[PDB]
Structure 1
């Protein structure tokens, strides 16, 4: 029997679906795991790894991040509030990346995906940092279908956390690019009711949300800095068996609380 797991099992049973959790305390090496190696749909949470892949490319292409992109209306997608606002202005690669991370801007995400060689190009970047689980197969908005048993556009909580650690705290990006990725995540506007709701107000947090909507499917991953202590990296993913099952932000926050409590 697994006593650590029992509160997570109770939470997912009340939710009416499955919750996947992985958390790492980078100071002690302690972990918390619940369904940590199961696949869950990425939804918009791929956009954080997208921005990291762009930062990696910018290391060897001088001025890439500073480059303005002047897209047309044909590039717009529902829920692209920054791309629409700057349609008559244009946006730099850095501004598109920040919009994808911090507002989940769909047009910005698809524009950057195209620059990288599409979903396959992002998947190849994730392979290059040692992530063998991540796969992106489709673009916005098709990638949100979240069909039970479909492995397209999925990863695991453990692989998400491991890759997030490499990119925000490890050596997968050069230091100026690692710092920019952290700065973008810290400025996220979409996650105030998820992992951020589970951490003390005085701690620093960078996160990226995802919401497929269908099949009760939504998620959040984050790097968390308790004041003066080594950071924690964690991921919380959900899904449910029926198409019209509703996702829950409160369940994600409650799972994040249990993860922080279970760490040594």
Structure 2
């Protein structure tokens, strides 16, 4: 597999495993490397979380506008938006934007509670035809990224296929699809990952995940090249040792090879 060789060299230099799946929605061309292996979701589940909330909001009038007056008991390390708005409260929309664009942990747990926990989010993903995704735990425990542990994992392919359905397909009603896309486009945490691999004039929406341990980090994105059909892709990493470091540069490099390999 000559197409795969640059990915193999990249993961070998990295000292771990890289998983990549990219699809050009105009041509149907794909690029695949370890595309069907499981990788920890880490914070990347927060994108799909927001999508599941949006789906619910279609059936529950004023859900996204509803103020949540959470207490300090809801707060978790690295919840900068939720801590800032503790004395104000936040709407469901605002919590979703915080989870997506700042990877806010408390906001993510608050929204998970609304869906009936990790099982509720998993059930939503099953409803759109994703049989791979599983979320089992809450923030921060879901980040353990233990090699061989299937909890809180998906595959680059399933992540890409689900992202396509939600952002470009018919899984959400149109206004809700647009809100999801807009939240992804406003992400603040991904500037050194897939965004670093894309020509500066192309629009990008992404969600990052960073477990930290076991060299485990990731990003998925929808990319709109000027005047062409969008591309959807996912890049996930992991490594065998607890103190192995993740690398944003490796994620960006894998993204570049994916865009180059497309037809």
Runs of 4+ in 1 over 3 A off after TM superposition: none
Structure 1 residue runs of 5 or longer lacking an equivalent are none
The alpha carbon displacement at 1:247 in A equals: 0.2
Please give the alpha-carbon distance, in whole angstroms, between the structure 2 residues aligned to 1:79 and 1:150.
25
SS at match of 1:64: coil
The alpha carbon displacement at 1:228 in A equals: 1.0
User: Alignment length, in residue pairs?
Assistant: 263
Please give the alpha-carbon distance, in whole angstroms, between the structure 2 residues aligned to 1:26 and 1:257.
17
1:124 matched residue in structure 2: 123
Please give the alpha-carbon distance, in whole angstroms, between the structure 1 residues aligned to 2:139 and 2:60.
26
Please give the alpha-carbon distance, in whole angstroms, between the structure 1 residues aligned to 2:227 and 2:93.
30
Render the CA deviation track for 1:135-170: whole Å, top value 9, x for unaligned. Answer: 000000000000000000000000000000000000
In the alignment, does 2:197 pair up with 1:165?
A: no
Structure 2 residue runs of 5 or longer lacking an equivalent are none
The alpha carbon displacement at 1:71 in A equals: 0.4
The alpha carbon displacement at 1:85 in A equals: 0.3
Please give the alpha-carbon distance, in whole angstroms, between the structure 2 residues aligned to 1:65 and 1:247.
35
SS at match of 1:56: helix
The alpha carbon displacement at 1:70 in A equals: 0.4
The alpha carbon displacement at 1:176 in A equals: 0.3
Please give the alpha-carbon distance, in whole angstroms, between the structure 2 residues aligned to 1:147 and 1:73.
30
Please give the alpha-carbon distance, in whole angstroms, between the structure 2 residues aligned to 1:64 and 1:245.
42
Please give the alpha-carbon distance, in whole angstroms, between the structure 2 residues aligned to 1:203 and 1:23.
16
TM-score (norm 2): 1.00
Please give the alpha-carbon distance, in whole angstroms, between the structure 1 residues aligned to 2:83 and 2:229.
39
SS at match of 1:197: helix
The alpha carbon displacement at 1:192 in A equals: 0.1
RMSD (Å) for aligned C-alpha atoms: 0.2
SS at match of 1:51: helix
Please give the alpha-carbon distance, in whole angstroms, between the structure 2 residues aligned to 1:34 and 1:122.
27
